[PDB]
Every structure is written in structure tokens, then in C-alpha cells.
């Protein structure tokens, strides 16, 4: 039920933000200028 | 001959960068008391040069 | 110092009402070279 975490400053596209997702058999760590939605969740 | 303009540098920022930290944001500096929320001019400068 | 360090540990537990009253030492996992000013964070949850 718990996949990963996001680490940022404003959690929008203005500044860069980290993001970790626990792939089923991998890891998807990426630090980009993500425009995070107000309710982040990983859907399957 | 044209003095390539693709090489830029941050001339304005609101703090001092920490070691090995990268800043890529392009928000307009609010230099003076003017809000500077959107557009530029007077006391609103584009951070990069 | 511009480095994001993650340590981790997995332990088998039985009483789940709270964290166990034991002693497990987390071991280093990653030392990623990421330069950002991390101030806030949020947890991801799977939504099937
Ligand atoms: C480190 O990141 C923090 C988080 O944004 C920055 O803190 C801001 O600092 C400015 C300084 O002018 C304050 O006006 C803001 O209120 C602060 N934001 C807060 C408290 O959420 C800080 O500037 C960053 N520093 C570097 C060197 O990147
Ligand atoms: C809720 O709904 C949409 C559906 O496309 C989802 O992608 C989006 O992240 C959510 N919208 C928000 C949090 O504003």
C-alpha cells in the first residue's frame, strides 16, 4: 500500500522536486520539475 | 561572431547558494517593494543574464 | 551537503499496535547526489 515518497520545496513546476516510486521489481527515483497534483497517488 | 547567447548565468537571487546545489527556477526577482507577481519592469528583473 | 542519503532496515514484528521496544540498526542504502532544498515531503499510496 505504501510505494514511495516525494521531496520538494513547493511541490510544483516552479522548483525541482524529488520523487521515489517502488516499481514492482525496480525503483524509479527521479528529481525533476514535477507539477505534483494536490492528491498524489500511484494508481494501478 | 554573434557572441553565443545560449550561455546564461544567474545575476539575481534571493539567497546564497549552498554547496553543490543547482538552481534552475526562472521566477522573476521581487527586488523592490513592488509585488513583481508577473511580468517585469522597474524593480522586477529577469533572474538570468 | 547536496547529497540525499537513505538508510533502511526490515524487521519481522508481531505486536503492531506501536513500534517495537527492541533495537535494530538501519544500514545504508543509497547516497544519491541530488542538489535541492528539500523542505516538505509526502508519502505515495497505491490506489487500485
Ligand atoms: C532553501 O530552501 C528554503 C525553502 O524554500 C528557502 O527558504 C526560504 O528563504 C527565503 C529567503 O528570502 C524566505 O523568504 C522564505 O520564506 C523561505 N521559505 C520558507 C521558509 O518556506 C531557502 O531560501 C533555500 N536556500 C537555498 C540556499 O537554496
Ligand atoms: C483528480 O482527478 C484527476 C483525474 O484525471 C487526477 O489525474 C488528478 O491528479 C486529480 N486532480 C487534482 C488532484 O486536482
From Swiss-Prot, chain C:
Glycosylation: residue positions: 37
Domain of life: Viruses
Result after altering residue 25 to V: In strain: 20A.EU1
Effect of residue 13 to V: In strain: Omicron/BA.2.75
Phenotype when changing residue 16 to E: In strain: Omicron/XBB.1.5, Omicron/EG.5.1
Effect on the protein of changing residue 37 to Q: Increased resistance to neutralizing antibodies
Role of this protein: Attaches the virion to the cell membrane by interacting with host receptor, initiating the infection. The major receptor is host ACE2. When S2/S2' has been cleaved, binding to the receptor triggers direct fusion at the cell membrane. When S2/S2' has not been cleaved, binding to the receptor results in internalization of the virus by endocytosis using host TFRC and GRM2 and leading to fusion of the virion membrane with the host endosomal membrane. Alternatively, may use NRP1/NRP2 and integrin as entry receptors.
Subunit structure, interactors included: Binds to host ACE2. RBD also interacts with the N-linked glycan on 'Asn-90' of ACE2. Cleavage of S generates a polybasic C-terminal sequence on S1 that binds to host Neuropilin-1 (NRP1) and Neuropilin-2 (NRP2) receptors. Interacts with host integrin alpha-5/beta-1 (ITGA5:ITGB1) and with ACE2 in complex with integrin alpha-5/beta-1 (ITGA5:ITGB1). May interact via cytoplasmic c-terminus with M protein. May interact (via N-terminus) with host bilirubin and biliverdin, thereby preventing antibody binding to the SARS-CoV-2 spike NTD via an allosteric mechanism.
Protein name (record): Spike protein S1
Natural source organism: Severe acute respiratory syndrome coronavirus 2
Complete-protein stretch covered: 198 to 245 of 1273
Amino acid at each position: 500500500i505504501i510505494r514511495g515518497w516525494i521531496f520538494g520545496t513547493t511541490l510544483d513546476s516552479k522548483t525541482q522536486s524529488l520523487l521515489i516510486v517502488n516499481n514492482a521489481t525496480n525503483v524509479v527515483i527521479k528529481v525533476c520539475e514535477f507539477q505534483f497534483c494536490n492528491d498524489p497517488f500511484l494508481g494501478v | 561572431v554573434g557572441g553565443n547567447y545560449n550561455y546564461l548565468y544567474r545575476l539575481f537571487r534571493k539567497s546564497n547558494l549552498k554547496p553543490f546545489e543547482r538552481d534552475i527556477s526562472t521566477e522573476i526577482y521581487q527586488a523592490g517593494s513592488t509585488p513583481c507577481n508577473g511580468v517585469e519592469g522597474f524593480n522586477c528583473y529577469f533572474p538570468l543574464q | 551537503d547536496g547529497y540525499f542519503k537513505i538508510y533502511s532496515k526490515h524487521t519481522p514484528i508481531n505486536l503492531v499496535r506501536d513500534l517495537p521496544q527492541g533495537f535494530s540498526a538501519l544500514e545504508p542504502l543509497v547516497d544519491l547526489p541530488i542538489g535541492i532544498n528539500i523542505t516538505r515531503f509526502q508519502t505515495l499510496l497505491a490506489l487500485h
